[PDB]
Design a protein around this nucleic acid. Sequence first.
DNA 1: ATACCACTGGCGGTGATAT
DNA 2: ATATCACCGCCAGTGGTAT
DNA 3: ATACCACTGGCGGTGATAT
DNA 4: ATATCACCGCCAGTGGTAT
Lengths: 199, 198, 199, 198
Amino acid sequence: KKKPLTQEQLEDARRLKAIYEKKKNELGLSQESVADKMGMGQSGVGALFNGINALNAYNAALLAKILKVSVEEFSPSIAREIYEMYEAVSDAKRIEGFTLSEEILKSDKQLSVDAQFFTKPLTDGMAIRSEGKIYFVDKQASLSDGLWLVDIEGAISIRELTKLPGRKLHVAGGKVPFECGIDDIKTLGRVVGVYSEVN
Amino acid sequence: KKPLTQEQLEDARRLKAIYEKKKNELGLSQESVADKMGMGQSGVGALFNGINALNAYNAALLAKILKVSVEEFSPSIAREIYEMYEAVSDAKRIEGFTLSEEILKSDKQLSVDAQFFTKPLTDGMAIRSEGKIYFVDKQASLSDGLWLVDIEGAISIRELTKLPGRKLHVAGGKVPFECGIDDIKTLGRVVGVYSEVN
Amino acid sequence: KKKPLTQEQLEDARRLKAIYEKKKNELGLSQESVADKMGMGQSGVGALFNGINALNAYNAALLAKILKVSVEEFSPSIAREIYEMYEAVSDAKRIEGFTLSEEILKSDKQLSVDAQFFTKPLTDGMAIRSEGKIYFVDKQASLSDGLWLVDIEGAISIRELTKLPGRKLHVAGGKVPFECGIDDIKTLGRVVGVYSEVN
Amino acid sequence: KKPLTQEQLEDARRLKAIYEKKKNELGLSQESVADKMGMGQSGVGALFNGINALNAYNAALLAKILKVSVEEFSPSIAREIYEMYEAVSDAKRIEGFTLSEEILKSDKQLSVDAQFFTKPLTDGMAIRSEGKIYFVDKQASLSDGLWLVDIEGAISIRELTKLPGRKLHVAGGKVPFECGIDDIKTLGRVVGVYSEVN
DNA sequence: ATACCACTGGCGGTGATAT
DNA sequence: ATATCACCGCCAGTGGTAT
DNA sequence: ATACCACTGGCGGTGATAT
DNA sequence: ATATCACCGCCAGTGGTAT
């Protein structure tokens, strides 16, 4: 028959068409050049772009790969569907990502990590990439001796802490270890896992 | 028309067996699963007995009702569900293994984001040994580094160092030793390692 | 008056126009959007693109920066002029660049280095980037004890060599030092300078 | 019309002085330089006396005839010649300095490719000390690392380590010492070092 | 050999039309 | 949003010249 | 509670026109 | 090189049913 595209598919097509017309020259693609990649004809490509045929998860997956974008960039609904379907194979956790350069923390792309990486249910957590390593930080953990993502007077660095009597601390990890009170250091989270490449 | 592909009925074989063997624990009938899928009882029976094949949606939906991963009853479908998960949050699914007592045993396929590796990992392995996760490039050129090797049937992580004369310097044990290139079967090179604390 | 664009300027304009029409959407630019960046009007922009006004070194420099390309990509003549003019300030040497990953050497972008970096006239030289460092290699140097870019049975690595009696060698730099004959190692050049970032 | 900008005649002041003071060594007259530039003697006299200003071409051309860098007689022109050299082989011109006896002295401006620095270097310095080249980020946030510092008039390379209480751990001498942040003037942070062998 | 003198060719634009 | 049209200021150079 | 039976709605295309 | 036009196979599901 003919179904009229329930107006989220219609607006998804508009973003998809807009995200293609401005990047076809960037990638040297045409509607037939995309038709061959999907195993279709040019008639089928224009239907998806001009909001005549409703695209599915498979087509959205390939269309995102052809344009090297995310389905979120043109269809946030299916990306929710993709994440929901991926909860069946393995509950990979979408951890917000950060970068630590010059002791400065900046938000970055969210990071996908399987729940098997962690021995505890990391609900509020971060993923900081620094010095060729990725540090997985538990934002809600009790203060104890261990590896912590701390802040010392406007500088963020990974340091190993050791509680001392008299409400003092021992900070290790920097080029020079030192001691100070527990309130001289702001704790942003406890490091629970470290990933690194060949060193 | 009922031309189900040989594996599409093979998908139904495991799916049907999982349903009846586990419906006692979950206490659900076919029409109860039908309600949770927005379907009738007639729609669910087709999938179980091999009348109608499974798509990506209801196969993952059934994998949430039954506490079973979709790869357990349909490896082909779970492969394509991942291939859709590369479009959003482009993680890279890697076959999982465990290394205990120099024996490599298969494990659950792991979900790893592509931002872990500087070099793209086409054929990769994830091995869980000594409480850590070792990521291995199955097809990697022989370079001095950490390698998952096979020494006369024993699987172990060793540090390979190439020496002139097609020799190797295997390290990792109490005392390192030297041998030829062909004396060891190098499964792949370790590119990343992950471990927890406490 | 009116000068007819001596046919290298004409063909330079064709490449410039071609390199702009396929990247204006990639950069969100129009002829007026480029006119404001150069301090001109849209009429002046079209003259350069359509081969009516001959562009100079200054305009080519800005046009290359606006499109984030090199003048070589659309006007190899002026890039020669730019290099010739830059020989007046400081004779920066255009050294061919290489990358060394997994003990595999691959050609890369040519590297610009001032002649003050070297104490000798490095005519035939390489620049290899590896392990966060840039190694400047003299391809024509006498064999002697020092840092060399060698090849050992199909693997390229930076190793420190030491000549030994009996036509033997000592190779250092790898994870395991070893000894072998001088003919068991192929020498591709002698390292004369090393640059590195914060380590 | 003869409206030469104040510096454009200042360009001619140094250029004219360089020509006459060095024409004895090179043994060339104005018409001889005119021949090498595709010009007449009348065209060269305008540039020397300040009648016609210099563009990028003949200023660099004159910098090749006279064995003098164009920055010596025209800093403004050499700046724009570099700004054209960023379009092809995008090197980054950095002000050069030498560090001898704790005294920072200016030197020739260095030509460095942008592929040396992970982070773009807007305001940078190149310092030649102890036979090596230290690249310094003039405007860099205070982070634990190697810094070009000024300690009561003395210029030196030191390893700064921040300590709680707005303190510093200065290292590099026989014995390190501690002081406050404001006790030292940090000119900039060292991001790259180059050295030769033999 | 070199520093003035008008004189001027063409470089590098402008500013309004379409379409 | 681009292309093609006259139109042109105005420093670049020129020759010719008296030092 | 569950496995057959036709029957069929609409999903996801095709294939030729312009322009 | 794109847009809009009919046209439609054909597995997806449906209800109804006898276990």
